[PDB]
Amino acid sequence: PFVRVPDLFGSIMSTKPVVNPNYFAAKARGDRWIARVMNFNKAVAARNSKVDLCFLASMWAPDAPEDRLVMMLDWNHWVFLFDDQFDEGHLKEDPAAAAEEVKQTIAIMGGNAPRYTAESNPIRYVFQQCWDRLKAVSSQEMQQRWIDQHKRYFDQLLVQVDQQVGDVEAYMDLRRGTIGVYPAISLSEYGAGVNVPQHVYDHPSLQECMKVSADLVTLVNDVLSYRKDLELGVDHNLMSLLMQRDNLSAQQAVDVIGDMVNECYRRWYLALAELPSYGEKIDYNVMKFVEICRAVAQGNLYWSFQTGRYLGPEGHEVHETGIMYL
Amino acid sequence: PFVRVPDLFGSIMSTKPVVNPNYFAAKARGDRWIARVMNFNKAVAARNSKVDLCFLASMWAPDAPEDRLVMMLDWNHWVFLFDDQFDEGHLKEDPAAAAEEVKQTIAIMGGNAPRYTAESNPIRYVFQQCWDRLKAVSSQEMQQRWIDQHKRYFDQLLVQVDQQVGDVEAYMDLRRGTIGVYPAISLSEYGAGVNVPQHVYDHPSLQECMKVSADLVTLVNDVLSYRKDLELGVDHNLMSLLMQRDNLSAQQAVDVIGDMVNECYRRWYLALAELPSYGEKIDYNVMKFVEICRAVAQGNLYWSFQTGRYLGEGHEVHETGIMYL
Amino acid sequence: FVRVPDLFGSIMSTKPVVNPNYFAAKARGDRWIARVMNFNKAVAARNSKVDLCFLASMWAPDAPEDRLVMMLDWNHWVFLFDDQFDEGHLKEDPAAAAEEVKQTIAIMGGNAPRYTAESNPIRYVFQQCWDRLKAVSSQEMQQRWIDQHKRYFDQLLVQVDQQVGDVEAYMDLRRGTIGVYPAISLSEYGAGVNVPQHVYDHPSLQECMKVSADLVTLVNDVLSRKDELGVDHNLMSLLMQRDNLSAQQAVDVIGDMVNECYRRWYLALAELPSYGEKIDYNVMKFVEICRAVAQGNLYWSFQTGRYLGGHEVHETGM
Amino acid sequence: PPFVRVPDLFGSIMSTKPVVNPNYFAAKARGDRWIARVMNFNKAVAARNSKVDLCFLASMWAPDAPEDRLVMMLDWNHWVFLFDDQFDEGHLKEDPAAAAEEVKQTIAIMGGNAPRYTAESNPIRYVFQQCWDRLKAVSSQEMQQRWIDQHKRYFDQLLVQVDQQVGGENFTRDVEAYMDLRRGTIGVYPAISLSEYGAGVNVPQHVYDHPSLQECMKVSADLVTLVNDVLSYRKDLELGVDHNLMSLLMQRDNLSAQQAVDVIGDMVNECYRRWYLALAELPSYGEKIDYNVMKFVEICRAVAQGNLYWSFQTGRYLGPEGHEVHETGIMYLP
């Protein structure tokens, strides 16, 4: 059988995506570097290359210069390897060790961390290398924003571990953090050279744009991963949550996710309506920040279909037809 | 003395404007063509070139191919020459003749119009040349759109005449039509090759986006033309209406216009919040249409400053906000 | 080791422009060829990693998406087709190699049947490319495509005879066998460039195509350490035998040949007459196509580990 | 004759579609009103300068100069234009001592003992100083010296021009001598230095001085001279000028106007031949240097292609109708 999936390419997702022309040069530099850093064999490095996090980063900040794009690729490799420790690895059912990993990773960011090496701790090494470059070209305010957005991610990782070993709104709240879109937006502020002032960034409208970006990524992933989750019999996902809540069929559940996607767009514009002008000079950067929020979600969407992340090399037919066979 | 003009480059006006790369080639064609058609002397042709309607058109549809950008330039020359007849020229206080001009110009678009030549009626000739091009690459539906949006403009011209020979809301209502923003959006649909289906176009959100575009052009023009209006003693403008109605200083009135500009941005986003999705394929072109609405207003703004339309040194009013009087 | 010559000098030293439609075209064409050819998962993944889309995307960087997909289909075709003669069932079978060429030629306006993926997958792909080529190309450009493919098919048959059955003979065979000439035809389609035949046939432009083919041959020879496979039918071997040279000395002579290509390029262009602005505008685009086919092959060779697994060989110079 | 058929000036390396810097509009807005303020241009002279549109010219020389560097370029073009007129038609035209003193004081701006000028105290020198300040701030010593040396090549030829003007000898009849003085006074060599700054191109001196790259610069200068000679013929006739390539060729070989124009056409196409022959002799210096060499070669091409398109666009020689000369190849004569 099948479900008719919601069109995920509507409204602000419907425009032609722009990809960083430095994609090829950065992919060559960053895929081999992380392979060297992590001791990837020939197979693992090729699998990672296929995953192509460079494509994702290249849509988040399409005019980042090559060196910043490489840092963004390094960060995406970090996130991917870091996050795995909590979802599937040695921290998955260990709240005390998870909290300590978070504590030591935070300490990298201007705290009392040692100088790591690839050999002493390869994952923390990558994060430290990203932080060095971040802190070299960012104001103190920017540096603190990067710290604070990563802490929003780390905080929900710890909530997740507590739930692992130890409601749609509660699910979305958790995913908002764990999906990693908030620090991804900080990373893109760095790649694109955008520095919205903190008091403007803190406006509820811009905070809602970030929320919308994180929700769109969560919702798209929950749609596209359904076949895979069904194959491997998982339970911790929004489809299963909606089906179990009211005994919805898969089709009825996916339709509800379609409603939430379309409500993201409504929230987006209603937030922008409430966002005051701060004058041309600041507004110029506010619109670039708004574009970063959109591009993180649209990048996730195109990258998911491009790389066969959830639907294999033939998942593009889901895009064209709207049918996701099971 | 002076007034501090409100920032006109906030919000959706604050982005870096994209300009058609065909600007130079289209300008080299269309400027000397209109000078020939209109018999412009060397000095009048030079002034028209300065006015640089090509720059304006080049921001309305920045990826229009050269031949369509040319048409766009011809249309901009047409509408400036056409409109002058009603604002300042022989139709200004003649309702009967104004109605006949509209009737004859409407007949060009698939009606019973004769074939005009540059020698028989140069202004109608330009419009006919534009219509011929428009028809040749547009669906029947897009031809009728073009017709209907031009009629929204013509209708307010006839209203204006009646008043010429004869309320902020009524002021904005009339300007919305006479500013020519609605047919300019139809022109840009042609130039950019964007054909949103009529049932989507007619959605109130997209109609509100066009109205916001037209309001923005009206309000920007009223702000920037204040010094010129004071010099000439112009009295039928938004600044005089606001000062008269609410007993405001010039600074207080200019600031009210700035409030109205900012309310345009709020209306814009509130409209888009209500805009339904029609699926990716249509939505792709809807977003291009929305950008056309934005670009027509941003084009007017940058063109006003670039060409010294109202202020000559006007870039310093941009930088400081100070409009000396 | 050998210090390989700098292959990124002169007209190869510019920053490469890659078609922005790369991602969309790769998504369509890679899965399409896997289905046509019944690739298993591992073979399809290997093919995507080979990334012929990147190659095509540098040949014609402003091709629209549909044309780029056409170019990607063609590149998969030539890769599969050429392997039938270099290692497949036609490698030492002149009678069958001649029959394959005949049936492939017949696709291009001849008596060929309507192929399907089921009856003959490789012939089906080539037939799908020819249909698209013929739909948007003048009769003159159609004939040029046919004729450049025959310069390719001919050297294939010569190659098979030298299997069953002089640097200049080596280069002349390679020029025909590498496929640079039909790739230039493909790029004329992708880019929408239609130089008149009498200008195309001028010796200067023919030399520009010859220079492009030689550059591709020479870069392949240099990059292909792989030849730890025991092979001997290559340029390095021919130069070490003939002149009693070490590998380093031989590699250095190939670098001299590469730099001689660039001198030939400019000497050819010095002789190219003007046909007026209108035509010259498209001639300059055709010259860029010739340059881009060679530059595309160079960057693709390095980007995909095709020969070296290599971006360090680029930076440090094997 | 009532007309001549002019050669196709848009062939070969001039046939490409020119790329124009997207910062054109913002740079022009800044630079035109700045120069008008520096030079106290009245309303009409400022509008005339805007029309002349040296920004369009600079925007084709270095089409991806960032806005601030394009602004400098525009400033320099305005400087050159006003500076050069002093020697061609102004107060230095027949004054070898004043001309030498101006050159000395302008050379002193470039790291010598010049004072800090203001728009009030010497506006033309002030502009050159503001340009030099920005040039030096982002250029190595070697590139500073190259800019100085190329400006000195232009200044030297200006001094030769003034010496010839007061010496009262007959207009030359030696094409070689004609072309050599024009190459020097046209200002193409310092324009290439400016574009090396506008485009951030840094060819090392030993490569720059290779005869192939010097010939690319020479071809660029010759093309600008030859295009100017063809396009200005009508206005030269109108104004009665006799010191130009058309008259030299007609006098020397007893040619009609059409035959003389045809020879200039031959000279333009020989420029293209020389260009490629020079490139054939240019060595490779490895990827990193050759990358800059290819951009430098493009600068040489774009300075000449920019002159051609700008001349037509702005009506410099033929008015807004000169585009028809391009379209038809026919130039009508008074």
Swiss-Prot record, chain B:
GO terms for molecular function: magnesium ion binding; sesquiterpene synthase activity. Its cofactor is Mg(2+). Induction: The botrydial biosynthesis cluster genes are co-regulated by the Ca(2+)/calcineurin signal transduction pathway, which is under the control of the alpha subunit BCG1 of a heterotrimeric G protein. Expression of the cluster is also positively regulated by the cluster-specific transcription factor BOT6. The keyword Magnesium applies. Binds 3 Mg(2+) ions per subunit. Pathway: Secondary metabolite biosynthesis. Mg(2+) 2 binds at residue 83. Belongs to the terpene synthase family. This is Presilphiperfolan-8-beta-ol synthase. It comes from Botryotinia fuckeliana. The chain holds residues 59 to 390 of 399 of the full protein.
UniProtKB/Swiss-Prot annotation, chain C:
The keyword GTP-binding does not apply. Induction: The botrydial biosynthesis cluster genes are co-regulated by the Ca(2+)/calcineurin signal transduction pathway, which is under the control of the alpha subunit BCG1 of a heterotrimeric G protein. Expression of the cluster is also positively regulated by the cluster-specific transcription factor BOT6. This is Presilphiperfolan-8-beta-ol synthase. GO terms for molecular function: magnesium ion binding; sesquiterpene synthase activity. Mg(2+) 2 binds at residue 82. Binds 3 Mg(2+) ions per subunit. It catalyses: (2E,6E)-farnesyl diphosphate + H2O = presilphiperfolan-8beta-ol + diphosphate. Keywords: Lyase, Magnesium, Metal-binding, Virulence. (2E,6E)-farnesyl diphosphate binds at residues 306-307. Belongs to the terpene synthase family. A motif (DDXXD motif) lies at residues 82-86. Mg(2+) 3 binds at residues 220, 224. Mg(2+) 1 binds at residue 82. The Asp-Asp-Xaa-Xaa-Asp/Glu (DDXXD/E) motif is important for the catalytic activity, presumably through binding to Mg(2+). Presilphiperfolan-8-beta-ol synthase; part of the gene cluster that mediates the biosynthesis of botrydial. Botrydial is necessary for colonization of plant tissue by the T4 strain. It is a strain-dependent virulence factor since highly aggressive strains like SAS56 or B05 still retain substantial virulence when botrydial synthesis is impaired, since they produce also botcinic acid. The first step of botrydial biosynthesis is performed by the sesquiterpene synthase BOT2 which catalyzes the cyclization of farnesyl diphosphate (FPP) to presilphiperfolan-8-beta-ol (PSP). GO terms for biological process: farnesyl diphosphate metabolic process; sesquiterpene biosynthetic process. It is an enzyme of class 4 (lyase). Disulfide bonds: none annotated. Pathway: Secondary metabolite biosynthesis. The lineage of its organism: Eukaryota, Fungi, Dikarya, Ascomycota, Pezizomycotina. Its cofactor is Mg(2+). Its EC number is 4.2.3.74. The keyword Ligase does not apply.
Curated annotation (Swiss-Prot), chain D:
Belongs to the terpene synthase family. Mg(2+) 3 binds at residues 228, 232. One of its GO terms (biological process) is farnesyl diphosphate metabolic process. It catalyses: (2E,6E)-farnesyl diphosphate + H2O = presilphiperfolan-8beta-ol + diphosphate. The Asp-Asp-Xaa-Xaa-Asp/Glu (DDXXD/E) motif is important for the catalytic activity, presumably through binding to Mg(2+). Pathway: Secondary metabolite biosynthesis. The gene is BOT2. Mg(2+) 1 binds at residue 84. Binds 3 Mg(2+) ions per subunit. Presilphiperfolan-8-beta-ol synthase; part of the gene cluster that mediates the biosynthesis of botrydial. Botrydial is necessary for colonization of plant tissue by the T4 strain. It is a strain-dependent virulence factor since highly aggressive strains like SAS56 or B05 still retain substantial virulence when botrydial synthesis is impaired, since they produce also botcinic acid. The first step of botrydial biosynthesis is performed by the sesquiterpene synthase BOT2 which catalyzes the cyclization of farnesyl diphosphate (FPP) to presilphiperfolan-8-beta-ol (PSP). Keywords: Lyase, Magnesium, Metal-binding, Virulence. Its cofactor is Mg(2+). This is Presilphiperfolan-8-beta-ol synthase. Induction: The botrydial biosynthesis cluster genes are co-regulated by the Ca(2+)/calcineurin signal transduction pathway, which is under the control of the alpha subunit BCG1 of a heterotrimeric G protein. Expression of the cluster is also positively regulated by the cluster-specific transcription factor BOT6. It comes from Botryotinia fuckeliana. The keyword Magnesium applies. Mg(2+) 2 binds at residue 84. It comes from the Eukaryota. (2E,6E)-farnesyl diphosphate binds at residues 316-317. Its EC number is 4.2.3.74. One of its GO terms (molecular function) is magnesium ion binding. A motif (DDXXD motif) lies at residues 84-88. The chain holds residues 58 to 391 of 399 of the full protein. It is an enzyme of class 4 (lyase).
